Amino acid sequence: PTHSALYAASCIKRIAQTLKLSGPQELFKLFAPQLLYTWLDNDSIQDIAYEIFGFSSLLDLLREAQTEAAAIMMMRGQEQEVCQLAQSLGLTPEKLVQQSFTKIIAYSIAHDGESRMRKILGKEEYLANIHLNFADIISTFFDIFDQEDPIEKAFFAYAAETLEEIKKLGPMFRAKYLPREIVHLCSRTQYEPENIWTPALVVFVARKLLKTIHPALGPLHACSVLRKIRVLICLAGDHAISGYPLEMLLHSLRVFVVDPECADDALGITQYLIKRGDEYLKRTPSF
């Protein structure tokens, strides 16, 4: 997508209706990234089909698609179109960019344009926004990174052996980026890019990864999310094998071990965690 508008509308209503989903808009909430990317590649947001994903408006479709659309525009570059989005909304481009700063930086760092963010906010405000949105940015970095060849890039001189052990037991951007990406963001805050893996951040990112999976989204999603979790566990190192992170990971990886699709990934991570956290599991026999 004239009748094709109405037919696609009824089809999406039936898809999200017979899948334990709320409505058609809650089916756009799951797929807006890919649709918006592939469509805004060569088109403009203002002429999109607000009749699929029943919205009854374009200013209704926008009060949800600010973040993805704005971040993708600023990923490729449509400055006048970001300004047009902002005009249509009611908010000037500046407070808009202040609303969706996290995804903007996630994509931009992935697609390398941050200087273009400095030229609209400033050079003492942009850094305050990076300080305010650090963990959300790392979470959005683990969302979009594609699992291609992480061990090759690792040698970050400890992730390689760790991922090798966990493999011996049992918008998309390439894995080769992932370390350097983090570095480039963390060379503008105070916290050094080397060692930023306190347990709060670890549990944050891991819960994000798990929440990403979904029952309606397929049993092929899960094994990719699991590979990325293995990357997080090998990278975090010694904070994800002791304390509450250990308990929290053992739980969900158990749930992935009873999945008949792939119990090759989760059995390995589980062996590694149980074996390495022996000094801790002897203090908590009730768990």
Tell me what portion of residues adopts beta-strand conformation.
under 5%
User: Termini distance?
Assistant: 54 Å
Structural shape: globular
Largest sheet: none
**SS elements, strand count:** 0
Helix-strand string: HHHHHHHHHHHHHHHHHH
The structural class is mainly alpha
Question: Tally the helices: what do you get?
Answer: 18
Q: Fraction of residues in helices?
A: 55-70%
Rg estimate, integer Å: 21 Å
PDB class: transferase
Keywords: Kinase, alpha solenoid, pikk, nucleus, tranferase, dimer, DNA damage signaling, transferase
Entry title: Complete CtTel1 dimer with C2 symmetry
Name: Serine/threonine-protein kinase Tel1
Q: Can you walk through the features of this model?
A:
With 287 residues, the chain is mostly helical. The chain is built from 18 helices and no strands. It has helices at 4-17, 25-40, 58-62, 66-76, 79-89, 93-99, 101-110, 114-118, 126-132, 134-144, 150-154, 159-169, 178-186, 199-212, 221-236, 244-257, 264-276, 278-281. It is globular. It is found in: Chromosome, Telomere; Nucleus. Belongs to the PI3/PI4-kinase family. ATM subfamily. Disulfide bonds join 223-262.
